[PDB]
Design an enzyme around this catalytic site. Structure first.
Site, PDB file in Angstrom:
ATOM      1  N   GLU A  70       3.141  46.841 -16.478  1.00  0.00           N
ATOM      2  CA  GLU A  70       4.538  47.246 -16.613  1.00  0.00           C
ATOM      3  C   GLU A  70       5.220  46.563 -17.796  1.00  0.00           C
ATOM      4  O   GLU A  70       4.928  45.410 -18.119  1.00  0.00           O
ATOM      5  CB  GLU A  70       5.305  46.945 -15.323  1.00  0.00           C
ATOM      6  CG  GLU A  70       4.922  47.847 -14.155  1.00  0.00           C
ATOM      7  CD  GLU A  70       5.598  47.446 -12.858  1.00  0.00           C
ATOM      8  OE1 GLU A  70       5.541  46.250 -12.501  1.00  0.00           O
ATOM      9  OE2 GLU A  70       6.179  48.325 -12.186  1.00  0.00           O
ATOM     10  N   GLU A  85      -2.572  48.990  -5.168  1.00  0.00           N
ATOM     11  CA  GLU A  85      -2.071  49.360  -6.491  1.00  0.00           C
ATOM     12  C   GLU A  85      -2.279  48.219  -7.488  1.00  0.00           C
ATOM     13  O   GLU A  85      -2.236  47.053  -7.109  1.00  0.00           O
ATOM     14  CB  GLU A  85      -0.588  49.763  -6.377  1.00  0.00           C
ATOM     15  CG  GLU A  85       0.258  49.676  -7.659  1.00  0.00           C
ATOM     16  CD  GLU A  85       1.659  50.263  -7.482  1.00  0.00           C
ATOM     17  OE1 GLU A  85       1.811  51.232  -6.713  1.00  0.00           O
ATOM     18  OE2 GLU A  85       2.612  49.763  -8.114  1.00  0.00           O
TER      19      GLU A  85
END
Ligand SMILES: [Ca+2]
Length: 185
Positions: free
Chosen positions: A96, A92
């Site tokens: 964010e 991944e």
């Protein structure tokens, strides 16, 4: 990977390109934006708002023009991921935004279930106030994160390799996504 290059302006919700976790998450605006909404429980996934791609994607340039939600506690995200997903390595790559401070952005990545690569970068602007383009160029030997076309961080070790789906999530109020672009370089 199963998916090639694409541009998503979010004028219509393409179900061939995306799928909603819950029809509720997850609404289109009249101004060509995808909107995520969190109401109201932690901790996702999948107890938060979220959208994901139908196809999986690999190495290439991922660009997202978005605005995170501005509120303490919540996290707005754009990321590729294998899930997991058992019988598959957890690979991944993350962009964010912590709602408590949207003048910062956090980069991270996971490879075979090993993350802890958190790099917090001061943006020089409040991400919630206007649209900015956030990107990562994912190649086998480097991830390079960009903010408005300017290089902000580079990772060169333990880079993920497994193709994953593109996600948008809001968890832990709206996050808006103007457009997305993947370029299979
Ligand atoms: Ca748009």
């Amino acid at each position: 990977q199963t998916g090639g290059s694409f541009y998503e302006p979010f004028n219509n919700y393409n179900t061939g390109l995306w799928q909603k976790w819950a029809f509720d998450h997850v609404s289109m605006t009249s101004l060509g934006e995808m909107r995520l909404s969190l109401t109201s429980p932690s901790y996702n996934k999948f107890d938060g708002g979220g959208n994901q791609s139908v196809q999986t994607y690999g190495y290439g340039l991922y660009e997202v023009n978005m605005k995170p939600a501005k509120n303490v506690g919540i996290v707005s995200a754009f990321y590729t991921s294998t899930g997991p997903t058992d019988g598959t390595p957890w690979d991944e790559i993350d962009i964010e935004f912590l709602g408590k401070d949207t003048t910062k952005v956090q980069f991270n990545y996971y490879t075979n279930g090993v993350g802890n690569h958190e790099k917090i970068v001061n943006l020089g602007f409040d991400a919630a106030n206007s649209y900015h383009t956030y990107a990562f160029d994912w190649q086998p030997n480097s991830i390079k994160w960009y903010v408005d076309g300017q290089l902000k961080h580079t990772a060169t070790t333990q880079i993920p390799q497994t193709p994953g789906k593109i996600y948008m999530s809001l968890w832990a109020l709206y996050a808006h996504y103007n457009w997305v672009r993947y370029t299979k370089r």
